[PDB]
Amino acid sequence: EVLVDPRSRRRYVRGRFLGKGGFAKCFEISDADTKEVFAGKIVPKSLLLKPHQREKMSMEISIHRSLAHQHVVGFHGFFEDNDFVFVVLELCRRRSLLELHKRRKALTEPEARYYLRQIVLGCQYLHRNRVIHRDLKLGNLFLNEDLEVKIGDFGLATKVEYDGERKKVLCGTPNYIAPEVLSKKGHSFEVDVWSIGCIMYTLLVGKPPFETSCLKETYLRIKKNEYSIPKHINPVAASLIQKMLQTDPTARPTINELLNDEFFTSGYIPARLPITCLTIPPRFSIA
Ligand SMILES: Cc1ncc(CCCN(C)C)cc1Nc1ncc2c(n1)-c1ccc(Cl)cc1NC(=S)C2
Ligand SMILES: [Zn+2]
């Protein structure tokens, strides 16, 4: 019920349940002194009996704590007792792109541009810091009160240690999983750009690129590149999706190139979005 840090002498009440991912149960929490409000991932040690498991949890924190950016969920601290691990993160009051997508389905182009821009800004930061998220999806992309985007859940993230490194395995299963991970051909940064492609598609279209009833049939399509963009999607968008969803990872654009695509440069990107837009499609009228 209460959660105490020895080293910082800070105590947090446990509030409402938000969700679960991996071994973590995540709750809204508040500091007993400042009444300031946080997001609290609570991982049971009962599930970290094995070294391999313990190291991932330990890597997650190492990576997350190394991060400070406008579009990355703010890291605030960690502590433990004998039974549980406790990680304290920024609370994103307006949930995630995933909830938005289930309420609104396909968004308008300029909403997509807005979110997409922020996502690519968060990811540019990661990549310049030699970090690959490896699991970017709508459920990961969080929204603060101003509907600003915060990348979260670093539990599949890896740090690149040397130039031209090719990671050989990925422990766990990403949602928008790159074809080169599936083919166990080795992988690096292009997996995040891959995911963004799927996310762009999903925001513009109202459903994921490669969906089927069998995950393993989905995996099949991802290998064969079997997906179509409907004809009502704009061809400047279509070009981008197509660019980002390429089997050959050397062909896909880097994160730093993406904001200089016609799709951002010759299209309208809102400075901000109103709350209304959580539920009602913004027409963007001139007055
Ligand atoms: C306040 C709030 N309410 C509802 C949701 C939606 C949770 C389920 N959705 C992602 C499928 C999100 C938030 N905001 C919110 N804000 C910060 C976090 C979280 N959620 C959160 C929550 C659940 C999980 Cl499993 C991971 C997780 N990750 C991070 S880095 C901290
Ligand atoms: Zn493993």
Ligand 1: which of 92, 101, 140, 147 to mutate, most ligand atoms within 8 Å of CB?
A: 92
Resolution in A: 2.5
Query: What homologous superfamily is domain 7-95 in, according to CATH?
Result: Phosphorylase Kinase; domain 1 (3.30.200.20)
Residue with tokens 């513009």: 204
C-beta separation of 61 from 87 below 8 A: yes
What is the rounded CA–CA span in Å between residue 123 and residue 127?
6
Pair of tokens at residue 279 = 């539920």
For the chain, how long is the longest CA-to-CA vector?
61
Distance 25 CA to ligand 1 centre (A): 10
Q: Among 149, 191, 156, which residue's Cα sits nearest to residue 170?
A: 156
* CA gyration radius, the chain: 19
Number of alpha carbons in the 13 Å side-chain half-sphere of residue 225: 12
State whether the beta carbon of 224 lies less than 6 angstroms from ligand 1: no
What is the rounded CA–CA span in Å between residue 111 and residue 281?
9
DSSP codes joined into one string, the chain: -EEE-TTT--EEEEEEEEEEETTEEEEEEEETTT--EEEEEEEEGGG--SHHHHHHHHHHHHHHHT---TTBPPEEEEEE-SSEEEEEEE--TT-BHHHHHHHH-SPPHHHHHHHHHHHHHHHHHHHHTTEE-S---GGGEEE-TT--EEE---TT-EE--STT--B---SS--SS--HHHHTT--B-THHHHHHHHHHHHHHHHSS-TT--S-HHHHHHHHHHT-----TTS-HHHHHHHHHHS-SSTTTSPPTTTGGGSHHHHTS---S---GGGGTSPPP----
Distance 61 CA to ligand 2 centre (A): 17
**For residue 24, which atom of ligand 1 is closest to its CA?**
25
What is the rounded CA–CA span in Å between residue 222 and residue 175?
12
138 in a known ligand binding site: yes
What is the rounded CA–CA span in Å between residue 132 and residue 126?
7
Per domain, the residue ranges of the chain are 7-95, 96-268
User: Rounded to the nearest 5°, which phi and psi values hold at 11?
Assistant: -125, 135
What is the rounded CA–CA span in Å between residue 135 and residue 90?
19
Buried residues in 69-104 as b, exposed as e (16+ CB within 10 A): bebbbbbbebbeeeebbbbbbbbbebebbbebbeeb
Pair of tokens at residue 272 = 């901000």
Number of alpha carbons in the 13 Å side-chain half-sphere of residue 150: 25
Angle CA 186–141–264, to nearest 5: 85
Ligand nearest to the CA of 50: 2
Q: Among 152, 112, 69, which residue's Cα sits nearest to residue 261?
A: 112
State whether the beta carbon of 94 lies less than 6 angstroms from ligand 1: no
| CATH code, residues 96-268 | 1.10.510.10
Distance 49 CA to ligand 2 centre (A): 14
What is the rounded CA–CA span in Å between residue 127 and residue 151?
13
Q: Active site includes 192?
A: no
Residue with tokens 């859940």: 153
Residues across the chain: 287
From 5, 31, 81, 135, the catalytic residue: 135
Beta pairing, strands 75-80 & 84-90 = antiparallel
Residue with tokens 């809102």: 270
Q: Among 155, 122, 184, which residue's Cα sits nearest to residue 55?
A: 155
Q: Among 196, 68, 74, 77, which residue's Cα sits nearest to residue 128?
A: 68
Buried residues in 33-45 as b, exposed as e (16+ CB within 10 A): eeeeebbbbbbeb
User: Rounded to the nearest 5°, which phi and psi values hold at 260?
Assistant: -105, 40
